[PDB]
Nucleic acid binder design. Structure first.
Lengths: 70, 88, 66, 259, 117, 104
RNA sequence: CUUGAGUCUCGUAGAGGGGGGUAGAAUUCCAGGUGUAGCGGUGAAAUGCGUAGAGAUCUGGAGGAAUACCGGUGGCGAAGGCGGCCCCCUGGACGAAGACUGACGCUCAGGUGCGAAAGCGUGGGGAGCAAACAGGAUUAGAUACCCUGGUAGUCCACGCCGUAAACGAUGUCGACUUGGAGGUUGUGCCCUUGAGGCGUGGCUUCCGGAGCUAACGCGUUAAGUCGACCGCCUGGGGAGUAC
């Protein structure tokens, strides 16, 4: 996330750009994931469970949407 | 795997028509040549278990082929095992 | 909306650095196939090409390093 | 018999997919829904805002015919994608007609350059232009009477992205998105883009040749968090947006709307 | 001491404590300050406010070097990441580059074990 | 026999030597009745990252239909030769003769 | 005899296996520069490291281990399992047409082999992590959870061990029975008039019909309808223990 302040650019804007760049990089998240060790099984489990949750969110709620609430 | 030219050769010798390629004897031979080839490999690479699994399968299939030949036609089997030098 | 299918390339070239640079990050990262919409078959080889480039110092591994 | 088979292929022969064949007869109007029947499986839930012309009142009563659009079928019940898009094909045909004689002649009134180029409006729709095209020369319609009437003489079009720039004055004078994504880039090039779907964190206005923009939730207005995009803009409408940010790598052009 | 116009700010932002270190462009450190040293302990020094005041202190320290331009490198995750740089800005330097300088391995060493809490 | 694709890199200070080495390489390939389908002196080039502390280096691309033994010999030569900092012998299916995207 | 089974021809994708090279990031240590009082850690601390100059910061070097992004209810493998690039040797799978062989098949008690992690032996290696251990906390106590350190081991070579919730808790092979939404990998035709249109094969994720089921659920990848062979069960404990 290397950044250079443009000529006649506000500081705050520059900071915002940097924050955006960092977010894009996923650096903080990267760090968080590497703080301590995750067992392979745990990693697999998380990935799978997340996928399951995603699929539920995609399909079951769509089905629910078809019917009106009131 | 066996090189195409070598396949073609072995087929030519043992196959009657040289277009057949499926003749029991031909097949036996193909397997035998492959087994011979892989012997050097596995002399080098003793832990290559996965590849050896194939080797064993090929052997077993050769073996079955030999048995089939025996029951069908004994002489032909004899000639095949003199050509290839198979102890049995 | 894959490019490679439309172009119909047989294999991605690690030499064609410009094509590669489209699929790498500003930080040097290889871009996911979700974002690029590259086809899976084509994505793998693209990654392979990128890495070969990186070995050859045609592409950088990352923005920071020097 | 084969009566029916022959009819099936006949009825194939006498319809097409896009909004081309002006076939749907308006068989019920109520505010705020118009409905037609173009020989489809079901009737279209048409908005009233596809069918009021240039000053805000309706124009077609029962029995009137406009084609709609297709190639998307049954979200759960119903049939179509809207008919004004059909009008876009007619506008494209008019623009192409220029090629024949190298001059398309309409009225074109371009007051100000949204994204460098004056905005030119043809009867109902208003399109955005690149800078040079508003004026044949440096004439600069800012000194002309506001919203003046000349014509449009085409200077530049993007040919996949509907950006068309036209020359208002001077009657005498007569993969693919992502490699060179530096055209609308620099910091602040504003665009006219139709929104597609509002995902409760976003609006997804994306018009310019197979790209994706997000004006997500923070700008959109001059209130931050209590906004809920569906309340504040629209569904399916061409708006003010500009880039503010481009990734060419992770294909996230992050447009804005508070401007 | 020799005056220098342009230099660096290194911001080591940990979870527990922030460390600001101003240096010349070559690598030689001029001054430094810390949230822990600014008089912040435990809960208090792991905060953006602690970080900004540490940054302010560091800025004060290198007054005699008369630095004007500055580029910043931000290391690590912490609260004193944005706050620190804002504080630095306020202190009145021309911020030139903002760089993120976190060490990300490409799956190298095994991290320590997950805490059981 | 087998279509290899070689790209090796020379130290920039040795750029003037580069032709001779190329010739030498070529000769070996010819010795074993190995064909040489394309050959592109890329020249001096800025590195994406400084390998062995230097920032530029001299790229040579090279396409060969040759036996593995000579390829191995070439690899050994490269590894011992100090001029060439990096090499990449890389198999290929076909003789690809049309040349490279940026030579163009 | 050619349907099953197999061979031959051309391609295809693959973290399949074995060997040998190499790349970059990051940690650790060493040497040196700058520099000055803290660092570190937690819920909060303290042990610990620091003015014998730490932490921070820059330069150079050493060494080991693992390969960010790509990366995906993606791929390959009999299972265990397999992930940076390159090369060498090597096994399987699938498709396309043909050509051939002509039941050569399925299953399998004993038998033989492969078989995570930990563990053992001999010889190497040893960065990080870390059973054991030590100290600091917490606590009524704390032979734990948390913190600071830390040795076997983890790594390599060759042997042994032969077990795991070694799980789909679902033996293998074959046949038949409504559907939808995908993924992946082929392939035939079609104006590819465009990312497409119509098929046809392989593997694969989810939902669901009939039927089945104690229900939960399974549902063309069956836990449905049948055939062939094997393995295994007969109340709980005692006990997968004793001899």
């Amino acid at each position: 996330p290397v950044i250079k302040v443009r000529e006649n650019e506000p500081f705050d804007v520059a900071l915002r750009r940097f924050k955006r760049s960092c977010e894009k990089a996923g650096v903080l998240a990267e760090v968080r994931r590497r703080e301590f060790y995750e067992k392979p099984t745990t990693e697999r489990k998380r990935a799978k469970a997340s996928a399951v949750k995603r699929h539920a969110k995609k399909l079951a709620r769509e089905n629910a949407r078809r019917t009106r609430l009131y | 795997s066996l090189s195409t030219e070598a396949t073609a050769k072995i087929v030519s010798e043992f196959g009657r028509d040289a277009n057949d390629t499926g003749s029991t004897e031909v097949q036996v031979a193909l397997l035998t040549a492959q087994i011979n080839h892989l012997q050097g490999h596995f002399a080098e690479h003793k832990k290559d278990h996965h590849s050896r699994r194939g080797l064993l399968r090929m052997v077993s299939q050769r073996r079955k082929l030999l048995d089939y030949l025996k029951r069908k036609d004994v002489a032909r089997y004899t000639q095949l095992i003199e050509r290839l030098g198979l102890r049995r | 909306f894959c490019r490679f299918t439309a172009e119909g390339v047989q294999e991605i070239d690690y030499k064609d650095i410009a094509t590669l640079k489209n699929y790498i990050t500003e930080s040097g990262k290889i871009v996911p196939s979700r974002i690029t919409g590259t086809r899976a078959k084509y994505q793998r080889q693209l990654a392979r090409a990128i890495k070969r480039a990186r070995y050859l110092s045609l592409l950088p591994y990352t923005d920071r390093h020097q | 018999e084969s009566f029916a088979q022959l009819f099936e292929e006949s009825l194939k022969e006498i319809e097409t997919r896009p909004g081309s064949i002006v076939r749907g007869v308006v068989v019920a109007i109520d505010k705020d829904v118009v409905l037609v029947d173009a020989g489809l499986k079901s009737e279209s839930a048409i908005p009233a805002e596809q069918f009021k012309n240039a000053q805000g009142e309706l124009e077609i009563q029962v029995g009137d015919e406009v084609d709609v659009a297709l190639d998307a079928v049954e979200d759960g019940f119903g049939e179509t994608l809207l008919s004004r898009e059909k009008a876009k094909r007619h506008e494209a045909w008019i623009t192409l007609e220029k090629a024949y004689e190298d001059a398309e002649t309409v009225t074109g009134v371009i007051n100000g350059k949204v994204k460098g180029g004056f905005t030119v409006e043809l009867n109902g729709i208003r399109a955005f232009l690149p800078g040079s095209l508003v004026d044949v020369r440096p004439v600069r319609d800012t000194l002309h009477l506001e919203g003046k009437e000349l014509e449009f003489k085409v200077i530049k079009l993007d040919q996949k992205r509907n950006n068309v720039v036209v020359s208002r004055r001077a009657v005498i004078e007569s993969e693919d998105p992502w490699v060179a994504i530096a055209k609308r880039y620099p910091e602040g090039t504003k665009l006219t883009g139709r929104v597609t779907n509002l995902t409760d964190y976003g609006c997804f206005v994306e018009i310019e040749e197979g790209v994706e923009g997000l004006v997500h939730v923070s700008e959109m207005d001059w209130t931050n968090k209590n906004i809920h995009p569906s309340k504040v803009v629209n569904v399916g409408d061409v708006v003010e947006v500009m880039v503010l940010d481009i990734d060419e790598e992770r294909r996230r052009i992050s447009l804005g709307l508070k401007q | 001491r020799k005056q220098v116009s342009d230099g660096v700010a290194h911001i080591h932002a940990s979870f527990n404590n922030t460390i600001v270190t101003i240096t010349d462009r070559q690598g030689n450190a001029l001054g430094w300050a810390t949230a822990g040293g600014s008089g912040f302990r435990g809960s208090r020094k792991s905060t953006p406010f602690a970080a900004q005041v540490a940054a302010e202190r560091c800025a004060d320290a290198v007054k005699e070097y008369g630095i004007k331009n500055l580029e910043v490198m931000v290391k690590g995750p912490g609260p004193g990441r944005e706050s620190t740089i804002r504080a630095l800005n306020a202190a009145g330097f021309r911020i030139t580059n903002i760089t993120d300088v976190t060490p990300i391995p490409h799956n190298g060493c095994r991290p320590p074990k997950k805490r059981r809490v | 026999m087998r279509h290899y694709e070689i790209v090796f890199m020379v130290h920039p200070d040795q750029s003037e030597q580069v032709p001779g080495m190329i010739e030498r390489y070529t000769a070996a390939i010819t010795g074993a009745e190995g064909k040489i389908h394309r050959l592109e002196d890329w020249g001096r080039r800025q590195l994406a990252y400084p390998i062995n502390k230097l920032h530029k280096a001299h790229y040579v691309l090279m396409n060969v239909e040759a036996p593995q033994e000579v390829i191995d010999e070439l690899e050994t030569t490269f590894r011992f030769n100090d001029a060439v900092i990096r090499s990449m012998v890389m198999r290929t299916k076909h003789a690809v003769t049309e040349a490279s995207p940026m030579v163009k």
